[PDB]
Amino acid sequence: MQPFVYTTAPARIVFGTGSSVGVAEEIRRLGLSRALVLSTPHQKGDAEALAARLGPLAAGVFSDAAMHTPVEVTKRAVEAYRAAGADCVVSLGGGSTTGLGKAIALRTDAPQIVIPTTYAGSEVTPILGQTENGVKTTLRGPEILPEVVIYDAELTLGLPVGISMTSGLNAMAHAAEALYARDRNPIASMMAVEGLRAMIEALPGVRMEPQDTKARETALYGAWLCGTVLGAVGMSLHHKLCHTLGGSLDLPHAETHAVLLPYTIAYVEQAVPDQLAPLAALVGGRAGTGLYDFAARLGAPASLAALGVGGEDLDAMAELATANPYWCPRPVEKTAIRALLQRAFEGARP
Amino acid sequence: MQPFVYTTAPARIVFGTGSSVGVAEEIRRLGLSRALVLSTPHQKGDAEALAARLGPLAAGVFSDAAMHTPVEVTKRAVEAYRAAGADCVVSLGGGSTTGLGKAIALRTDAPQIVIPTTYAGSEVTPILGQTENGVKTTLRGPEILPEVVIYDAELTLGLPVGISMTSGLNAMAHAAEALYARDRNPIASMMAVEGLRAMIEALPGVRMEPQDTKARETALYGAWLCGTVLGAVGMSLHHKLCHTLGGSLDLPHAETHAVLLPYTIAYVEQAVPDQLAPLAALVGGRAGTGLYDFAARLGAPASLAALGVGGEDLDAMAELATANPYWCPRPVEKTAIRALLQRAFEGARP
């Protein structure tokens, strides 16, 4: 056996269809009483309805969360948190909403109750990416990890199919990289395999019937495990490239994951195919090409060209990706990253 | 899916052969500097050798750890801890030594760094048993769960084969009951299966070659996961029966588990075969009868009669077993418990 470290941090994860009826009780369980409910504009009404349900337990709604968690928006949200007299945040939504809550927590020590409605998995990680002056940078710390998460699959029925598929691939990216992360361990790897298995089973079902509560519950269960293993063992080249392009080119985030994943996994698989073998098994092929084929079954975008990236962007992106790199089992110098980005731009099978 | 709550607390688990060289580093990482090193009288030499190596970071050695964690010993240990200006404990050795550290932690808030040398699994539970002027008590709480565990298989090579087998079966019992816990969750269940797989692989290897570090590492990995699930979810018939029956008759603890497990698992398996299916699949298609066959493979005692129990004792045991009502997936009824005890007394196939 390879040596390892396995670490747990304090968290309370509530999982079940209809579990979101318990938001009030979870606020009270923390000894708190004035939540700022957070959303993007895409779930503004849902946030307002939740705030109304909370009554005296809601201090207000901030519905302006933004992709890539830009510092300008965080500054507004913190001012709103302070002015409202809030004592916690309730983050209703996807990864952008969770990210805002984390950015507020970093600045204010606000406890977070997160109600995820996508497969981003941010709700169970101590990691925060924030964008400032065209660069997204990541931080990790106990201040960032949400105290409480409420998983209610009924809240995912309305997630549009397209973003359901690419958010699903975003979840899979977490688990795939967990298999070869610097801080990998056998339990995180077991959980990563189960998360991948769940996503591979569920996403085609969700595509076939977006209102299928069984397929939605399986996908959300998978996303929980995929996010958990990201939080536990960290990340590598794939996440670095997503953060680089996402931040700097303002690319659609889940879509960037979906497009890059077959290429970044194919690259790493050349060096550690044994570590990626369990993923290769689940996709019924090689890990990289198998992901490309699976993403095609889901109808996900397959090229960076489809995301509006220009060939002229790639040099700068390859250079930026070598600043503050994430650990990788293969060397990831600028020449190699540029070639990988060229492959992803073209969108052909790895 | 069955809804669940998954709660974690802070813990760092360091796993690897030779890892015990890293105790100083773990004390430093906690920001602590005055460790009271704990042991039994036998491991006094080992404890003093560790304290010497710790230099500035050791406050002293207390080497009077005793079975069942008697309050008289704890009082002397706490007096030593407080007089030395200690700020944590290092619990080197068996379950008794882990218990002493927990008893000190209860009273002093001492962080615990546990270096287990057995399969007790106490190092990853929030449970503490104590004896006070003869009175055995059990408590549980977050203050009891050790902050740090260092698993070094090289420290387990001296565990005699007999107790290795029966304590290994006792560890498996935690995982088997975790699969049907009232508060079962997917992470505890995955851990449970993995712990069972590890013990099923390792224990026969240990029996063949007790000095084999590969088999020993796998067994210690199994013990960690089985202890973790003991710590995470509620046990049931098997544990309640071993506790009451072993406690009342002062029967050898691990041996009682080893004898009863096939029968108690068989009993529950009649009602919830699907929950035990992941275990049944590891032991030939039926969990209860499979565990009977597996235990025989290890040379474990196979009957209550082999543990000194007489036919005339069974009535009283059945009364004790049904004296204190608790949750089980199958009704616990005296008639069925009588039949279970008779089968266990005879050492017959379940």
Coordinates of all heavy atoms in Angstrom, one line a residue, chain A residues 101-157:
Chain A
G101 N -21.4 32.7 -1.5 CA -21.5 32.5 -0.1 C -20.2 32.3 0.6 O -19.9 32.7 1.7
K102 N -19.3 31.5 -0.1 CA -17.9 31.3 0.4 C -17.1 32.6 0.5 O -16.4 32.8 1.4 CB -17.2 30.3 -0.5 CG -17.7 28.8 -0.3 CD -17.1 27.9 -1.4 CE -17.2 26.5 -1.0 NZ -16.5 25.6 -2.0
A103 N -17.3 33.4 -0.5 CA -16.6 34.7 -0.6 C -17.0 35.6 0.5 O -16.2 36.4 1.1 CB -16.7 35.3 -1.9
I104 N -18.3 35.6 0.8 CA -18.9 36.3 1.9 C -18.4 35.8 3.3 O -17.9 36.5 4.1 CB -20.4 36.3 1.9 CG1 -20.9 37.1 0.7 CG2 -20.9 36.9 3.2 CD1 -22.4 36.9 0.5
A105 N -18.4 34.5 3.4 CA -17.8 33.8 4.6 C -16.4 34.2 4.9 O -16.0 34.4 6.0 CB -18.0 32.3 4.5
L106 N -15.6 34.2 3.8 CA -14.1 34.5 3.9 C -14.0 35.9 4.6 O -13.0 36.1 5.4 CB -13.5 34.4 2.6 CG -12.0 34.8 2.5 CD1 -11.2 33.7 3.3 CD2 -11.5 34.9 1.1
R107 N -14.8 36.8 4.2 CA -14.7 38.2 4.6 C -15.4 38.6 5.9 O -15.1 39.5 6.6 CB -15.2 39.2 3.5 CG -14.3 39.1 2.3 CD -14.9 39.7 1.1 NE -14.0 39.8 -0.1 CZ -13.6 38.8 -0.8 NH1 -14.1 37.5 -0.5 NH2 -12.7 39.0 -1.8
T108 N -16.4 37.8 6.3 CA -17.3 38.1 7.4 C -17.4 37.0 8.5 O -18.0 37.3 9.6 CB -18.8 38.3 7.0 OG1 -19.3 37.1 6.4 CG2 -18.8 39.4 5.9
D109 N -16.9 35.8 8.2 CA -17.1 34.6 9.1 C -18.5 34.1 9.1 O -18.9 33.2 9.9 CB -16.6 34.8 10.5 CG -15.2 35.3 10.6 OD1 -14.3 34.7 9.9 OD2 -14.9 36.3 11.3
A110 N -19.4 34.5 8.2 CA -20.8 34.1 8.1 C -20.8 32.5 8.0 O -20.2 32.0 7.1 CB -21.5 34.7 6.8
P111 N -21.6 31.9 8.8 CA -21.9 30.5 8.6 C -22.7 30.3 7.3 O -23.4 31.2 6.9 CB -22.8 30.1 9.8 CG -22.3 31.1 10.9 CD -22.1 32.3 10.2
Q112 N -22.5 29.2 6.6 CA -23.2 28.9 5.4 C -24.1 27.7 5.5 O -23.6 26.7 5.9 CB -22.2 28.7 4.3 CG -21.2 29.8 4.0 CD -20.0 29.2 3.2 OE1 -20.2 29.0 2.0 NE2 -18.9 29.0 3.8
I113 N -25.3 27.9 5.0 CA -26.2 26.7 4.8 C -26.4 26.7 3.2 O -27.0 27.6 2.7 CB -27.5 26.9 5.5 CG1 -27.3 26.9 7.0 CG2 -28.5 25.8 5.0 CD1 -28.6 27.3 7.7
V114 N -25.9 25.6 2.6 CA -25.9 25.6 1.1 C -27.0 24.6 0.7 O -27.1 23.5 1.2 CB -24.6 25.2 0.6 CG1 -24.6 25.3 -1.0 CG2 -23.4 26.1 1.1
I115 N -27.8 25.1 -0.3 CA -28.8 24.3 -0.9 C -28.5 24.1 -2.4 O -28.9 24.9 -3.2 CB -30.2 24.9 -0.7 CG1 -30.4 25.2 0.8 CG2 -31.3 23.9 -1.1 CD1 -31.7 26.0 1.0
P116 N -27.7 23.1 -2.8 CA -27.3 23.0 -4.2 C -28.4 22.6 -5.2 O -29.2 21.7 -4.8 CB -26.2 21.9 -4.2 CG -26.3 21.3 -2.9 CD -27.1 22.1 -1.9
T117 N -28.4 23.2 -6.3 CA -29.4 22.8 -7.3 C -28.7 22.4 -8.7 O -29.4 22.3 -9.7 CB -30.4 24.0 -7.6 OG1 -29.6 25.1 -8.1 CG2 -31.0 24.4 -6.3
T118 N -27.4 22.3 -8.6 CA -26.7 21.7 -9.8 C -25.7 20.6 -9.3 O -25.8 20.2 -8.2 CB -25.9 22.8 -10.5 OG1 -24.7 23.2 -9.8 CG2 -26.8 24.1 -10.8
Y119 N -24.8 20.2 -10.2 CA -23.8 19.2 -9.9 C -22.4 19.8 -9.6 O -21.5 19.0 -9.6 CB -23.8 18.1 -11.0 CG -25.3 17.7 -11.3 CD1 -25.7 17.6 -12.6 CD2 -26.1 17.3 -10.2 CE1 -27.1 17.2 -12.8 CE2 -27.4 16.9 -10.5 CZ -27.9 16.9 -11.8 OH -29.2 16.5 -12.1
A120 N -22.3 21.1 -9.4 CA -21.0 21.7 -9.2 C -20.2 21.2 -8.0 O -19.0 21.1 -8.1 CB -21.2 23.2 -9.0
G121 N -20.9 20.7 -6.9 CA -20.2 20.1 -5.8 C -19.4 21.1 -4.9 O -18.8 20.6 -3.9
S122 N -19.5 22.4 -5.2 CA -18.8 23.4 -4.4 C -19.2 23.4 -2.9 O -18.4 23.7 -2.0 CB -19.0 24.7 -5.0 OG -18.3 25.8 -4.3
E123 N -20.4 22.9 -2.7 CA -21.0 22.9 -1.3 C -20.2 22.1 -0.3 O -20.4 22.3 0.9 CB -22.4 22.4 -1.4 CG -22.6 21.0 -1.9 CD -22.7 20.9 -3.5 OE1 -22.5 21.9 -4.2 OE2 -23.0 19.8 -3.9
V124 N -19.4 21.1 -0.8 CA -18.7 20.3 0.1 C -17.2 20.4 0.0 O -16.4 19.5 0.4 CB -19.1 18.8 0.0 CG1 -20.5 18.5 0.6 CG2 -19.1 18.3 -1.5
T125 N -16.7 21.5 -0.5 CA -15.3 21.7 -0.6 C -14.9 23.0 0.2 O -15.7 23.9 0.3 CB -14.7 21.9 -2.1 OG1 -14.9 23.3 -2.5 CG2 -15.4 20.9 -3.0
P126 N -13.6 23.0 0.6 CA -13.1 24.2 1.3 C -12.4 25.1 0.3 O -11.5 26.0 0.7 CB -12.1 23.6 2.3 CG -11.5 22.5 1.5 CD -12.7 21.9 0.7
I127 N -12.7 25.0 -1.0 CA -12.0 25.7 -2.1 C -12.8 26.9 -2.6 O -14.0 26.7 -2.8 CB -11.6 24.8 -3.2 CG1 -10.8 23.6 -2.8 CG2 -10.9 25.5 -4.4 CD1 -10.8 22.4 -3.8
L128 N -12.2 28.0 -2.8 CA -12.9 29.2 -3.4 C -12.0 29.8 -4.5 O -10.9 30.1 -4.3 CB -13.1 30.2 -2.3 CG -13.6 31.6 -2.8 CD1 -14.9 31.5 -3.4 CD2 -13.6 32.5 -1.6
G129 N -12.6 29.9 -5.7 CA -12.0 30.6 -6.8 C -12.7 32.0 -6.9 O -13.9 32.1 -6.9
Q130 N -11.8 33.0 -7.0 CA -12.4 34.4 -7.2 C -11.6 35.1 -8.3 O -10.4 34.8 -8.5 CB -12.1 35.2 -5.9 CG -12.8 34.7 -4.7 CD -12.5 35.5 -3.5 OE1 -13.2 36.4 -3.1 NE2 -11.4 35.1 -2.8
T131 N -12.3 35.9 -9.0 CA -11.7 36.6 -10.2 C -11.5 38.1 -9.9 O -12.4 38.7 -9.4 CB -12.6 36.3 -11.4 OG1 -12.7 34.9 -11.6 CG2 -11.8 36.9 -12.7
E132 N -10.3 38.5 -10.2 CA -9.9 39.9 -10.1 C -8.9 40.2 -11.1 O -8.0 39.5 -11.4 CB -9.4 40.1 -8.7 CG -8.9 41.6 -8.4 CD -8.7 41.9 -7.0 OE1 -8.3 41.0 -6.2 OE2 -8.8 43.1 -6.6
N133 N -9.2 41.3 -11.8 CA -8.4 41.8 -12.9 C -8.0 40.8 -13.9 O -6.8 40.6 -14.3 CB -7.1 42.5 -12.3 CG -7.5 43.8 -11.6 OD1 -8.2 44.6 -12.1 ND2 -7.0 43.9 -10.3
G134 N -9.0 40.0 -14.3 CA -8.9 39.0 -15.4 C -8.2 37.7 -15.0 O -7.9 36.9 -15.9
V135 N -8.0 37.5 -13.7 CA -7.3 36.3 -13.3 C -8.1 35.7 -12.1 O -8.5 36.4 -11.2 CB -5.9 36.5 -12.8 CG1 -5.2 35.2 -12.2 CG2 -5.0 37.1 -13.9
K136 N -8.4 34.4 -12.2 CA -9.1 33.6 -11.2 C -8.0 32.9 -10.4 O -7.1 32.3 -10.9 CB -10.0 32.6 -11.8 CG -10.9 31.8 -10.8 CD -11.7 30.8 -11.7 CE -13.1 30.8 -11.3 NZ -13.9 29.9 -12.1
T137 N -8.1 33.1 -9.1 CA -7.1 32.5 -8.2 C -7.9 31.7 -7.1 O -9.0 32.1 -6.7 CB -6.3 33.5 -7.4 OG1 -7.1 34.4 -6.8 CG2 -5.4 34.2 -8.4
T138 N -7.4 30.5 -6.7 CA -8.0 29.7 -5.8 C -7.3 29.7 -4.4 O -6.1 29.9 -4.3 CB -8.1 28.2 -6.2 OG1 -6.8 27.8 -6.7 CG2 -9.1 28.1 -7.3
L139 N -8.2 29.6 -3.4 CA -7.8 29.6 -2.0 C -8.5 28.4 -1.4 O -9.5 28.0 -1.8 CB -8.3 30.8 -1.2 CG -7.8 32.2 -1.5 CD1 -8.8 33.2 -0.9 CD2 -6.4 32.4 -0.9
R140 N -7.8 27.8 -0.3 CA -8.4 26.7 0.4 C -8.3 27.0 1.9 O -7.1 27.4 2.3 CB -7.8 25.4 0.0 CG -8.0 24.2 1.0 CD -7.2 23.0 0.6 NE -7.8 22.2 -0.5 CZ -8.4 21.0 -0.3 NH1 -8.5 20.5 0.9 NH2 -9.0 20.5 -1.4
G141 N -9.3 26.8 2.7 CA -9.2 26.9 4.1 C -10.5 26.6 4.9 O -11.5 26.5 4.2
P142 N -10.4 26.4 6.2 CA -11.5 26.1 7.0 C -12.6 27.1 7.0 O -13.8 26.8 7.1 CB -11.0 25.9 8.4 CG -9.7 26.7 8.4 CD -9.2 26.5 7.0
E143 N -12.3 28.4 6.8 CA -13.2 29.5 6.7 C -14.2 29.3 5.6 O -15.3 29.8 5.6 CB -12.5 30.8 6.6 CG -11.5 31.2 7.7 CD -10.1 30.5 7.4 OE1 -9.9 29.8 6.4 OE2 -9.2 30.8 8.2
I144 N -13.8 28.6 4.5 CA -14.5 28.5 3.3 C -15.5 27.3 3.3 O -16.5 27.4 2.7 CB -13.5 28.3 2.1 CG1 -12.7 29.6 2.0 CG2 -14.2 28.0 0.8 CD1 -11.4 29.5 1.1
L145 N -15.1 26.2 4.0 CA -16.0 25.0 4.0 C -17.4 25.3 4.6 O -17.5 25.8 5.7 CB -15.3 23.9 4.8 CG -16.1 22.5 4.6 CD1 -15.9 21.9 3.3 CD2 -15.5 21.6 5.7
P146 N -18.5 25.0 3.8 CA -19.8 25.3 4.4 C -20.1 24.4 5.5 O -19.8 23.2 5.6 CB -20.7 25.0 3.2 CG -19.9 25.4 2.0 CD -18.6 24.7 2.3
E147 N -20.7 25.0 6.6 CA -21.2 24.3 7.7 C -22.2 23.2 7.5 O -22.2 22.1 8.1 CB -21.7 25.3 8.8 CG -20.6 26.0 9.6 CD -20.1 27.2 8.9 OE1 -20.4 27.6 7.7 OE2 -19.2 27.9 9.5
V148 N -23.2 23.6 6.6 CA -24.4 22.7 6.5 C -24.8 22.7 5.0 O -24.7 23.7 4.3 CB -25.6 23.2 7.3 CG1 -26.8 22.3 7.1 CG2 -25.2 23.3 8.8
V149 N -25.1 21.5 4.5 CA -25.5 21.3 3.1 C -26.8 20.5 3.1 O -27.0 19.5 3.9 CB -24.5 20.5 2.3 CG1 -25.0 20.4 0.8 CG2 -23.1 21.2 2.4
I150 N -27.8 21.0 2.4 CA -29.1 20.3 2.2 C -29.3 19.9 0.8 O -29.5 20.8 -0.1 CB -30.3 21.2 2.7 CG1 -30.1 21.7 4.2 CG2 -31.6 20.5 2.6 CD1 -31.0 22.8 4.6
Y151 N -29.3 18.6 0.5 CA -29.5 18.0 -0.8 C -30.9 17.6 -1.0 O -31.3 16.6 -0.3 CB -28.5 16.8 -1.0 CG -27.1 17.1 -1.3 CD1 -26.1 16.9 -0.3 CD2 -26.7 17.6 -2.5 CE1 -24.8 17.1 -0.5 CE2 -25.3 17.9 -2.8 CZ -24.4 17.6 -1.8 OH -23.1 17.9 -2.0
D152 N -31.6 18.2 -1.8 CA -33.0 17.9 -2.1 C -33.2 17.7 -3.6 O -33.2 18.7 -4.3 CB -33.9 19.0 -1.5 CG -35.4 18.7 -1.7 OD1 -35.7 17.8 -2.5 OD2 -36.2 19.4 -1.0
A153 N -33.2 16.5 -4.1 CA -33.3 16.3 -5.5 C -34.5 16.9 -6.2 O -34.4 17.2 -7.4 CB -33.2 14.8 -5.9
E154 N -35.6 17.2 -5.5 CA -36.7 17.9 -6.1 C -36.4 19.2 -6.6 O -37.0 19.8 -7.5 CB -37.9 17.9 -5.1 CG -38.4 16.5 -4.6 CD -39.6 16.6 -3.6 OE1 -39.9 17.7 -3.1 OE2 -40.1 15.5 -3.4
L155 N -35.3 19.8 -6.0 CA -34.9 21.2 -6.4 C -34.1 21.2 -7.7 O -33.7 22.3 -8.2 CB -34.1 21.8 -5.2 CG -34.9 22.0 -3.9 CD1 -34.0 22.8 -2.9 CD2 -36.3 22.7 -4.1
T156 N -33.8 20.0 -8.2 CA -33.0 19.9 -9.4 C -33.9 19.6 -10.7 O -33.4 19.5 -11.8 CB -31.9 18.9 -9.3 OG1 -32.5 17.6 -9.2 CG2 -30.9 19.1 -8.2
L157 N -35.2 19.3 -10.4 CA -36.0 18.9 -11.6 C -36.1 20.0 -12.6 O -36.2 19.7 -13.8 CB -37.5 18.6 -11.1 CG -37.5 17.4 -10.2 CD1 -38.8 17.2 -9.5 CD2 -37.3 16.2 -11.1

